[PDB]
Amino acid sequence: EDDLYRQSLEIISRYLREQATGSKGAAGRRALETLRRVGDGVQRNHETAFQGMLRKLDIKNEDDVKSLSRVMIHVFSDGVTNWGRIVTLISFGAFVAKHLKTINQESCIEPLAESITDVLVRTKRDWLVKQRGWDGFVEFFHVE
Amino acid sequence: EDDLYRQSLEIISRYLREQATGSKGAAGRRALETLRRVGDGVQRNHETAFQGMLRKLDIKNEDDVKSLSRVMIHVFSDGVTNWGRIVTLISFGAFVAKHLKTINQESCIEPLAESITDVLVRTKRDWLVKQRGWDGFVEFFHVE
Amino acid sequence: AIXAXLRRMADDLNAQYE
Amino acid sequence: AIXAXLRRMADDLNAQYE
Ligand SMILES: [Cl-]
Ligand SMILES: [Cl-]
Ligand SMILES: [Cl-]
Ligand SMILES: [Cl-]
Ligand SMILES: [Cl-]
Ligand SMILES: [Cl-]
Ligand SMILES: [Cl-]
Ligand SMILES: [Zn+2]
Ligand SMILES: [Zn+2]
Ligand SMILES: [Zn+2]
Ligand SMILES: [Zn+2]
Ligand SMILES: [Zn+2]
Ligand SMILES: [Zn+2]
Ligand SMILES: [Zn+2]
Ligand SMILES: [Zn+2]
Ligand SMILES: [Zn+2]
Ligand SMILES: [Zn+2]
* CA A33 – CA A14 distance, rounded (Å): 11
Please answer yes or no on whether B123 and A76 come within 8 Å at the CB atom. Answer: yes
HSE on the CB side for B26, CA within 13 Å? 0
Helix ranges restricted to H, A22-82: 26-45, 47-60, 66-76
What superfamily in CATH does domain A1-141 come from? Blc2-like (1.10.437.10)
Per-residue b or e along A17-28, where b marks 16 or more CB atoms closer than 10 Å to that residue's CB? bbbbeeeeeeee
The type of residue at A118 is: D
Nearest residue on chain B to A72, judged by CA atoms?
B123
* DSSP conformation letters of B101-134: HHH-TT--SHHHHHHHHHHHHHHHHHHHHHTTHH
Please answer yes or no on whether B123 and A77 come within 8 Å at the CB atom. Answer: yes
* CA B12 – CA B5 distance, rounded (Å): 10
Asked if C11 contacts B84 with a C-beta cutoff of 8 angstroms, the reply is yes
How was this one solved? Answer: X-ray
Is residue B111 classed exposed, middle or buried when 0-12, 13-18 and 19+ CB atoms within 10 A define those classes? Answer: middle
Cβ neighbours around B105 below 10 Å, total: 9
Please answer yes or no on whether D10 and A56 come within 8 Å at the CB atom. Answer: no
* CA B55 – CA B11 distance, rounded (Å): 27
* CA B105 – CA A27 distance, rounded (Å): 54
- Closest CB to B88: pick one of C3, C13, C15: C13
* DSSP conformation letters of D1-18: -HHHHHHHHHHHHHTT--
* CA A42 – CA A2 distance, rounded (Å): 29
For chain B, what are the domain ranges? 1-141
Which of A56, A71, A75, A127 to mutate against chain D (most D CBs within 10 Å)?
A75
Please answer yes or no on whether C14 and B89 come within 8 Å at the CB atom. Answer: no
